[PDB]
Structure 1
Amino acid sequence: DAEAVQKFFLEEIQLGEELLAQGEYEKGVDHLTNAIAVCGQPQQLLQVLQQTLPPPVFQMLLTKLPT
């Protein structure tokens, strides 16, 4: 499953951004909470997450990051 997760992680990477783009900020982070912390480079995702997301959205994902 974990190898399939490496493609399933990309799904929330694709699908979850519209959920934030549509306006579900909490649900988009909740959808992306299942995604993060399985990739090989969480730090490389983190340095762009500081600016890919809106500044209120990213810090809310930081709260959901260890959850």
Structure 2
Amino acid sequence: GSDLKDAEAVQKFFLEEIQLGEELLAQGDYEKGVDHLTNAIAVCGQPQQLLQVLQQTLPPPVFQMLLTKL
């Protein structure tokens, strides 16, 4: 009930942040792009799989900066 609403709000934010971030990376804004991806990672309960996926899809120096941000 409220549990569904809680989960809905997180799932919307998660996908919206990843999609905003992806678009900023396409636009060559890595700075703001990574900031949004770190918002998606923040709401991720168990992020290790997500981080391994990001590591496959990002240049390593960018993955590395992302880690330094969390």
Which structure has more relative contact order (CA 8 Å, sep 6+)? It is: 1
Give the TM interval when normalised to the shorter protein.
0.7 to 0.9
**Root-mean-square deviation (Å):** 1.7
Unaligned runs of 5+ residues in structure 2 are 1-5
Greater Rg over alpha carbons, structure: 2
- Could you tell me whether the CA contact under 8 Å between 1:12 and 1:35 is conserved in 2? yes
CA distance in 2 between partners of 1:56 and 1:21 (Å): 16
Deviation per residue, 1:9-65 (Å, 9 max, x gap): 111111211111211111111122222121233011011111111111111100111
Gapped regions of structure 1 (runs ≥ 5): none
The TM-score with structure 1 as length reference comes to: 0.79
What count of residue pairs does the alignment treat as equivalent?
A: 65
The two structures have a TM-score, normalised by structure 2, of: 0.76
Structure 2 residue 38 is matched with structure 1 residue 38: no
Aligned to 2:55: 50
CA distance in 2, matches of 1:6, 1:15: 14
Partner SS state of residue 36, structure 1? helix
Q: Which has the higher helix share?
A: 2
